[PDB]
Design a protein around this nucleic acid. Structure first.
Ligand code: D3T
Ligand code: MG
Lengths: 65, 218, 426, 1006, 57, 69, 57
DNA sequence: GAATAAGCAATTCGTAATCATGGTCATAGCTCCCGCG
DNA sequence: CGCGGGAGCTATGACCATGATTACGAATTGC
């Protein structure tokens, strides 16, 4: 791996797809909330808590400083 | 006003620029017919044969066509007589006076009218004979009148017997009014309504009507 | 060629050339025969033969401003532009609809009065008409050298329906806003629906039509028919709020492709509601639109020109109303009364049995000719004793199907008219 | 005082006079002058009120006037057709008079002179000399034509005088121009009043030097210096051009019966008068028989406008303004009117006319001797070839080989000719007088005495060729027939189309029947259906087909149905089925089926669904009686046609019976012609409707018809399709044939009346005998009243390309198995004049090839298409590369007219550019050769546009340049399209058509 | 069945939108009809991609 | 409904709602792609029927608006 | 029941991403580091909105 | 000086207006890439 | 942290070129 340009291009192309997928999950969540069915999100609350925790340590460790 | 040189007869032909696309063919036919034409004493003088070549053709929309000049005293302009002794122009003036009401006139002249070109089919004739030089003027008459009917809107012919073949002698279609000759018997030229028919057919073609009172000479 | 009669024919050719956009198909064919005569006689001529002529009077009418504007000083005669179908009556002397160019059948007293009006002045290009609720109103009268108010009084003498002509005097640069538009519309004081007003100078042609409105879109509750004659019904379309949107013809319903529970392009006015002259963009064909309209109104209604017409038990009453005579119960006193009335007797002489029976029940011409052309007849002594239909392809048309349903009543009236014609002149 | 009428001719100017040219039995020419009046027909009250009184009035009898106006009725309250029976008067006015409400104005004053005075224009009369007064020597005046022309004696022969002439003019340009070009040779065929036929050619001595002139004198030719020194007996006379033109003026001023030329009014006589008034100022002065007035020879242009489309000016004929009574006859206009050929130039007309089959007696290196007799060709063909060969110089062997005559011997019953011919394999060849292997302008450049004598021979051949075409077409017999039947002057017989030649016997009828046909409303024209043309059931016929043709179908339809404008009771139309059924029931109960015929037609208007025309068959109509007159004349000339032995009289009588057939169909056609006085739209529409029902009746009785055990069964009943009649309707018809005949009939094709009946037999004699039995049985049982079918011929090897396009071998009714078949082409590429000779020859060769390898039958049709298309590609590439075939194989032809909807039509544009750029003018109605010519550097063109821009008008002086070439691609495309129409096998033909012309070929659908 | 009720809400809301399209599409001008037709082509792209994901996997 | 005029605000509202409907169906499509890439076994015959009815409804709405003249 | 296993797959995917970031992130260079920092802030905004949608009830 | 004319059917060939199909081009969505306060 | 400027992509309606379809007239012939 030389000059690290390909890795940056790959992570930009991946992270925009990740953003579109996250907005897609939010949109289908709004759809199933507007459908009128009763749902519980406690396991997904634990999941969003642990992924938010790990990505906050990633954000703390990714800074250029 | 371009000019060409010919071998004999007037030795020059003066013509307007609208007459240009039929000029070389005119020289081609005139160079063969004029040598035989010059022996007979013609009713107009040879220098007045192509006076009407000098007239333009864009402003003209009505061709008042005769078959030939007068047998005597041809002035080179069709239906023109300053002496006003010609029956044809007398009864043309009578018809125009019966139309427009202008009866106090010294004479009439079809050349001074805007939009009217006076034409003789055969450009000359023998002194004292009608349609004598038809033999010399066939191809020239066909050429020049087809050139006229390309530009003008309405063609008016002063004769039934003379212009019965005018739909074949001209190949491009044009508004042709085969009227009676003024000297035709039974006062057929007194009865007919050809000049207002010219005006109505001009208004059908969305053209400016001929004011026939411009031709009167006072 | 050269005679006086040829000059006369050429002058008529020029006169119908100047009124190509205004003439009926009879006068268009007369113009075409004159073009053929001038082509055979004068070889080339300026005018050609015409196959399809778009009927438009927009050469004599200015573009509609649709905004408030300052009025120049001068004399003004404001005329109410009504809602119904604009008809013009040229020197060919038949009714001409704008945008179609088809002659349309009218009551004979109106036709004779318009014949008298055109006999009064030959300088009139045409008379502009309203066909709304089957009542013929002169929009306007366009003449080269005469003010239209003289024609309005002259036709008021003959009995035509004439609007309230108003001549108002303007001396300053007055702004023509919507309020003065409402003042002038109520100054007309007509119950008749007006879409706009057109004004004319005293000495200067090229009429302007001024129209203040707003393009609106109201949700449609239903389509309701309203009786305007013995058999014919005007089309009307209703919003959910209860406001009534007026419809010009049934061809206005199919052309706008109106159905229930859909937004429509309506021109709101101060009082009336005006449905716009637009082509429907729903891409449904004309026949299916007719089918859906007849289904949502009722299968007893059929498209008859501009209006729906009803069906039912049709006897001597509608025959007497068609003949415009007093009511007779049996055949014999009916023939005796027709012998009493010479003009009605002459009308029955000039009009055939099928035409009398078709106009008696209010059937259209083309649809009924198409329906009769697809069935068979067992006929004994000029009477329809039995009928059966061969082609069921015409029965998809709900108008043709409705007339086929009322064909028994048509047979009864046809046999009655046949008996009347038999004992009148045989 | 016995005379025979030669010509009738009117005076023009001063007093209106009518003259008769006549000869007595001794040969002395007698002229009778008449006061020629303007004839008008008025009623009794209008005659009593004419403001000035008439010059002469004749009681015409109580004559009915019927208003022939076709007003459609939507019911059966048809008001009676307006008949006003009143006493009538014939107003004879010396000047033209405008009379209000005057009737019978469509007829001419000359026909009114004939019929009211009882004079037949082709008649022999004993003239009462008490009614004749002598004006001068040879001319008389007759004021009373009833009493003088009362005794009609039978026919006697007269010594007719003739002047056949042709002139030859020197041209160094493309065409002679009389202002610059002299006249080289004028030849005259003087046939005087004693029958002496003098053949003499005048040679211009101004083209020859004095030593050359002396050499011509030493060769036996005569030198003259003036008009008085001229000897008509000397066959070769040298003179100056002034003396030559004075001889021409002296001959044309003679009161001949007939001055007959070919293209002579347009070129020869016009050039004579033009050069005469140039060189000496003299004019050829025609004198009246009383010599009251004198006119000069001025060729007046007379133009026939078309009657279809924009009615443009479609034909130009040129005539002579003569008042002496000589019928100056142009054969060029006459053969354009009568014949249908690619070119109407004299070489093409003599190619078509004097074509004979000759066998070879002696074969040499360069001299082939041909003989022709009654055994080589038909009888009279070899005698005509000998009589043409008496003055001929070149004989065209077969079609493309031109051979100079070396020695000519005129036998007793044919010809023996030695020709400059290469050695040829076949023993018998077609001999004809076609083109010449000369270049006229080039042998004008090196003009010497041998050229002068050869062109004297060619010019005397053309002048005598006028006589040979005169007697070949039988123009004097045709003139007599036209004068007798059409009631017209002998000069006025041929110059007019159908309507004028109708107007004579029509007026004879209307005076006999006492009927006047008038109109009030304007006549309306609608498109109406015509004849029924069936689709061909299969393309190829290895089986015999029997051809049954109705004898004058549309005249017999008109006579049977009484289809006249005045016998039309009314036209019942219906916009709907209800009033259609009401009107049908009222039609059955109101109009009886025998007295009235009710003709169901397709509607004139789209709103109508039915149109029934009712015709009253109680009074015989004007159109049926006129048609009975014309088929009486046609049956008379068919009777002389069957009684004619020589091919000359056979061709003349066949042409005259065809002419009467055409005028009988023209009686029909004027009822469909809106500008005719006899226009009756319901009658012509009912004529085609009754004709179509006759077609369907004869088709339905013959389709599925079988003959078995001597008993012939028609598939449908023998019912009259219009009404119930007393004749039997049983299809089981007794024959006069052997019992063992078991044959089936299938109507495969019908082209209007002619139905093509395919018998399963292939024997010629059996098919001819069976079809004669079918014709007799149909005429006795199937048909009715005037309807009679005729078995024309047996068509073997019928190759039906499409409707009206078939190729077959004909076995006529008088023929048998041993008789030679005649190859009849009808509407194919061989007949069509817009199809080149290369196309015709290649399609004939490839049709013969296809017939051969279809008669082989051992190999599949896909390989038939492959082999024929491969041979086609090889032949077309060989023609494109080698270019051995000349321009004469690739000249198309079409007629020049002005009848064009567009003023910028490319054909009219091309002819006008030719007339501007070349001294040869193409008149209206002239046939010109045109070819598709492109520059030679242009390669093979796949995607092809602007085809009409490559057209070039080709004449006799045209030579294809080195830079120019024939555009072979359009001829090859048309030939390939015709061949792939013949070949079927559509997919591979599309592949070959795209690989060679890059387009989709048009395939005919059956 | 969260995706099933999501698609049920999708088809119900889209049925309401198509009902409004049926209400207003008779009087639509050309440019807005072209815009809603563009959105309908994007609709067809979305449901063909969903068809590909439920067919191929 | 009421008395509405000048449909371009209604056109923008219908296009915005159709944008929402497109984002919702693309959302469920890419999360279906993600859960199919996860590896769980799914049976989607009723899903295919729902897509077929959705496509029929969409082309029913389509056929009234696309074609001019 | 498909959303929880899809979320588990996303947990595995982000675990892979965080492990490879910890592998490679010894040098990042400043402009792409600022770009992925702004990407992480936009991602934090999106996850905050989804947290609001799961806590709104 | 001025004073007629036959119809329709059917086939082929060429020209020109019309339309199906495909290539291309402005343009609206449309969606990320980057950036600056 | 949040919205504006910008650039690349993807279709998409519209315009135009090319070639096949068809009406339209001429030309001919058969009838
Ligand atoms: C030739 C020709 C014919 N017709 C009409 C008229 C009838 C039908 C059939 O006539 P046909 O020549 O086949 O046979 P037909 O003449 O009827 O039978 P004959 O040869 O007279 O026995 O066509 C026509 O109108 N003009 C024409 O020039
Ligand atoms: Mg026949």
């Amino acid at each position: 791996l030389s000059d690290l340009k390909v890795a940056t291009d790959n992570i930009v192309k991946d992270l925009k797809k990740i953003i579109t997928r996250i907005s897609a999950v939010s949109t289908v969540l709004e759809d199933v909330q507007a459908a009128g069915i009763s749902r519980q999100f406690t396991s997904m609350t634990k999941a969003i808590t642990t992924l938010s925790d790990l990505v906050t340590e990633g954000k703390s460790k990714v800074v250029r400083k | 006003m371009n000019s060409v040189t010919i071998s004999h007869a007037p030795y020059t032909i003066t013509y307007h620029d609208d007459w240009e696309p039929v000029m070389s063919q005119l020289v081609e036919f005139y160079n063969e017919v004029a040598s035989w034409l010059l022996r007979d004493e013609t009713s107009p003088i040879p220098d007045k044969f192509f006076i009407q070549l000098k007239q333009p053709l864009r402003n003209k929309r009505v061709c008042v066509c005769g078959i030939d000049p007068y047998p005597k005293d041809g002035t080179g302009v069709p239906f023109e007589s300053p002496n006003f002794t010609k029956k044809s122009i007398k009864e043309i003036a009578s018809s125009i006076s019966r139309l427009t009401g202008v009866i106090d006139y010294k004479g009439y002249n079809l050349n001074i009218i805007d939009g009217v070109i006076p034409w003789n089919y055969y450009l000359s004739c023998k002194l004292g004979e009608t349609k004598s030089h038809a033999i010399y003027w066939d191809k020239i008459s066909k050429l020049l009148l087809q050139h006229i009917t390309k530009h003008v809107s309405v063609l008016y012919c002063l004769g039934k017997t003379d212009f019965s073949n005018i739909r074949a002698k001209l190949e491009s279609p044009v508004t042709t009014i085969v009227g009676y000759h003024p000297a035709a018997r039974d006062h057929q030229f007194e009865k007919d309504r050809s000049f207002e028919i010219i005006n109505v057919l001009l208004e059908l073609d969305n053209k400016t009507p001929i004011n026939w009172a411009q031709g009167f000479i006072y | 060629m050269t005679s006086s009669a040829d000059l006369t024919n050429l002058k008529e050719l020029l006169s119908l050339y100047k009124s190509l956009r205004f003439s009926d198909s009879v006068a268009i064919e007369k113009y075409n025969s004159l073009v053929e005569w001038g082509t055979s006689t004068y070889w080339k001529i300026g005018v050609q033969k015409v196959t399809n002529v778009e009927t438009s009077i927009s050469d004599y009418y200015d573009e509609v401003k649709n905004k408030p504007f300052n009025i120049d000083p001068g004399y003004y005669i404001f005329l109410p532009v009504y809602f119904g179908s604009v008809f013009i009556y040229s020197k060919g002397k038949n009714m001409v609809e704008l945008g179609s160019g088809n002659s349309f059948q009218i009551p004979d007293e109106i036709r004779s009065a318009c014949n008298k009006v055109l006999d009064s002045d030959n300088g009139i290009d045409f008379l502009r008409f309203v066909l709304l609720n089957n009542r013929w109103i002169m929009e306007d009268a366009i003449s080269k050298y005469q003010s239209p108010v003289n024609i309005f009084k002259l036709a008021s003498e003959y009995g035509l329906n004439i609007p309230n002509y108003l001549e108002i005097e303007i001396e300053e640069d007055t702004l023509f806003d919507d309020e003065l538009y409402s003042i002038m519309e109520r100054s007309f004081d007509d119950t008749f629906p007006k879409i706009s007003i057109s004004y004319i100078k005293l000495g200067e042609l090229k009429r302007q039509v001024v129209d203040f409105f707003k393009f609106s879109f109201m949700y449609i509750e239903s389509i309701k028919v309203d009786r305007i004659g013995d058999n014919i019904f005007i089309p009307s379309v209703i919003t959910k709020s209860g406001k009534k949107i007026l419809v010009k013809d049934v061809d206005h319903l199919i052309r706008s492709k109106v159905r229930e529970h859909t937004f429509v392009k309506v021109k709101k006015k101060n009082t009336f509601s005006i449905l716009y002259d637009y082509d429907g963009n729903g891409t449904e064909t004309r026949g299916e639109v007719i089918k859906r309209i007849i289904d949502t109104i009722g299968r007893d209604y059929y498209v008859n020109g501009k209006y729906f017409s009803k069906v039912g038990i049709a006897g001597l009453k509608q025959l007497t109303n068609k003949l415009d005579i007093n009511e007779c119960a049996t055949v014999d006193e009916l023939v005796d009364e027709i012998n009493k009335s010479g003009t009605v007797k002459r009308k029955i002489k000039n009009q055939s049995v099928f035409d009398l029976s078709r106009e008696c029940l209010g059937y259209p011409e083309a649809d009924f000719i198409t329906l009769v052309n697809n069935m068979r007849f067992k006929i004994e002594n000029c009477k329809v004793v039995n009928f059966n239909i061969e082609n069921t392809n015409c029965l998809n048309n709900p108008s043709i199907e409705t007339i086929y349903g009322n064909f028994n009543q048509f047979v009864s009236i046809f046999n009655t008219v046949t008996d009347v014609k038999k004992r009148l002149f045989e | 005082m016995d005379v025979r009428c030669i010509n009738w001719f009117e005076s023009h100017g001063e007093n209106r006079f009518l003259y008769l040219k006549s000869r007595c039995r001794n040969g002395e020419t007698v002229f009778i002058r008449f006061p020629h009046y303007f004839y008008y027909v008025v009623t009794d009250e209008i005659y009593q009120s004419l403001s000035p009184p008439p010059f002469n009035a004749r009681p015409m009898g109580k004559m009915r006037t019927i208003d022939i106006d076709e007003t459609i009725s939507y019911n059966l309250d048809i008001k009676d057709r307006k008949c006003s029976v009143a006493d009538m008067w014939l107003i004879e006015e010396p000047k033209k008079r405008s009379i209000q409400n005057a009737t019978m104005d469509e007829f001419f004053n000359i026909s009114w002179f004939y019929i009211s005075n009882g004079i037949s224009p082709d008649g022999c009369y004993s003239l009462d000399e008490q009614y004749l007064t002598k004006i001068n020597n040879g001319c008389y005046h007759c004021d009373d034509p009833r009493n003088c022309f009362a005794k009609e004696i039978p026919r006697f022969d007269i010594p007719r005088s003739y002047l056949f002439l042709d002139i030859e003019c020197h041209f160094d340009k493309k065409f002679p121009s009389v202002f610059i070009n002299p006249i080289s040779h004028t030849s005259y065929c003087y046939i005087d009043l004693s029958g002496k036929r003098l053949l003499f050619t005048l040679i211009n001595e101004e083209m020859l030097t004095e030593q050359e002139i002396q050499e011509a004198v030493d060769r036996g030719c005569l030198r003259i210096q003036s008009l008085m020194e001229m000897d008509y007996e000397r066959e070769l006379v040298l003179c100056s051009e002034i003396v030559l033109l004075r001889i021409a003026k002296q001959l044309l001023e003679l009161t001949f019966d007939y001055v007959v030329t070919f293209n002579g009014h347009n070129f020869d006589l016009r050039y004579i008068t033009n050069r005469l008034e140039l060189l000496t100022g003299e004019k050829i002065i025609f004198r009246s028989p009383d010599k009251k007035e004198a006119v000069h020879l001025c060729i007046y242009e007379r133009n026939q406008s078309s009657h279809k489309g924009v009615c443009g000016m479609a034909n130009t004929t040129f005539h002579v303004n003569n008042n002496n009574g000589t019928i100056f006859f142009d054969l060029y206009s006459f053969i354009q009117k009568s014949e249908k050929l690619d070119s109407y130039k004299l070489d093409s007309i003599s190619k078509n006319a004097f074509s004979c089959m000759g066998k070879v007696l002696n074969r040499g290196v360069r001299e082939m001797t041909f003989i022709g007799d009654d055994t080589t060709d038909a009888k009279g063909k070899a005698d005509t070839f000998a009589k043409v060969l008496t003055t001929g110089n070149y004989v065209t062997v077969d079609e493309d080989i031109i051979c100079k005559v070396i020695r000519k011997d005129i036998l007793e019953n044919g010809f023996k000719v030695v020709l400059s011919c290469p050695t040829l394999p076949n023993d018998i060849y077609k001999l004809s007088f076609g083109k010449d292997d000369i270049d006229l302008a080039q042998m004008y450049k090196d003009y010497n005495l041998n050229i002068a004598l050869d062109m004297a021979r060619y010019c005397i051949h053309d002048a005598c060729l006028c006589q040979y075409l005169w007697e070949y077409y039988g123009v004097e017999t045709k003139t007599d027939a036209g004068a007798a039947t059409y009631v017209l002057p002998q000069s006025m017989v041929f110059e007019y189309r159908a309507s004028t030649i109708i107007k004579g016997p029509l007026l004879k009828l209307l005076l006999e029947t006492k009927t006047i046909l008038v109109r009030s409303e304007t006549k309306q024209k609608f498109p109406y259906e015509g004849g029924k043309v069936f689709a061909p059931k299969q393309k190829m016929f290895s089986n015999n087909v029997l051809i049954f043709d109705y004898n004058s179908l549309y005249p017999n339809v008109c006579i049977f149905g009484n289809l006249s404008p005045e016998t039309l009771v009314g036209v019942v139309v219906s916009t709907n089925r209800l009033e259609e059924e009401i009107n049908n029931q009222l039609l059955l109960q109101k109009y009886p089926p025998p007295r009235y015929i009710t003709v169901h037609c397709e509607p004139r208007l789209p709103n109508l669904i039915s149109e029934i025309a009712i015709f009253d068959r109680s009074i015989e109509g004007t159109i049926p009686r006129l048609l009975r007159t014309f088929l009486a004349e046609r049956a008379r000339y068919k009777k002389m046609l069957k009684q004619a032995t020589s091919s000359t009289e056979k061709a003349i009588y066949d042409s005259m019976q065809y002419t009467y057939k055409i005028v009988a169909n023209s009686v029909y056609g004027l009822m469909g012609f809106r500008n005719s006085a006899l226009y009756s739209y319901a009658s012509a529409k009912s004529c085609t409707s009754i004709g179509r029902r006759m077609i369907l009746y004869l088709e339905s009785v013959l389709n599925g018809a079988e003959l078995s055990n001597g008993m012939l069964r028609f598939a449908n009943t023998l019912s009259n399709p219009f009404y119930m009649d007393d004749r039997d309707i049983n299809p089981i018809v007794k024959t006069s044939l052997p019992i063992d005949y078991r044959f089936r009939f299938r109507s495969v094709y019908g082209d209007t009346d002619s139905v093509f009946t395919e018998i399963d037999s292939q024997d010629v004699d059996k098919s001819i005998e069976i079809a004669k039995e079918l014709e007799r049985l149909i005429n006795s049982r199937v048909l009715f009243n005037n309807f009679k079918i005729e078995f024309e011929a047996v068509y073997k090897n019928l190759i039906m390309q499409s409707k009206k396009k078939y190729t077959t071998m004909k076995y006529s009714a008088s023929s048998n198995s041993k008789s030679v078949p005649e190859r009849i082409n009808k509407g194919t590429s061989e007949t069509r004049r817009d199809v080149s000779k290369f196309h015709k020859n290649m399609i004939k060769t490839y049709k013969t090839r296809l017939s051969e390898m279809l008669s082989e039958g051992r190999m599949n049709s896909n390989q038939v298409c492959i082999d024929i298309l491969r041979s086609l590609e090889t032949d077309l590439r060989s023609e494109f590369d080698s270019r051995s075939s000349p321009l004469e194989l690739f000249m198309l032809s079409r007629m020049h007219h002005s009848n064009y909807k567009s003023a910028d039509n490319p054909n009219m544009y091309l002819v006008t550019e030719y007339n501007k750029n070349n001294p040869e003018t193409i008149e209206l109605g002239e046939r010109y050769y045109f070819a598709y010519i492109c520059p030679a550097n242009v390669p093979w063109t796949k995607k092809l546009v602007n085809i009409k821009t490559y057209e070039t008008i080709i004449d006799r002086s045209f030579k294809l340049g080195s830079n120019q070439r024939i555009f072979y691609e359009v001829y090859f495309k048309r030939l390939t399209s015709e061949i792939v129409n013949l070949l079927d096998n559509k997919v591979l033909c599309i592949s070959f058509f795209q690989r060679m012309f890059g387009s989709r070929p048009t395939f005919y659908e059956a």
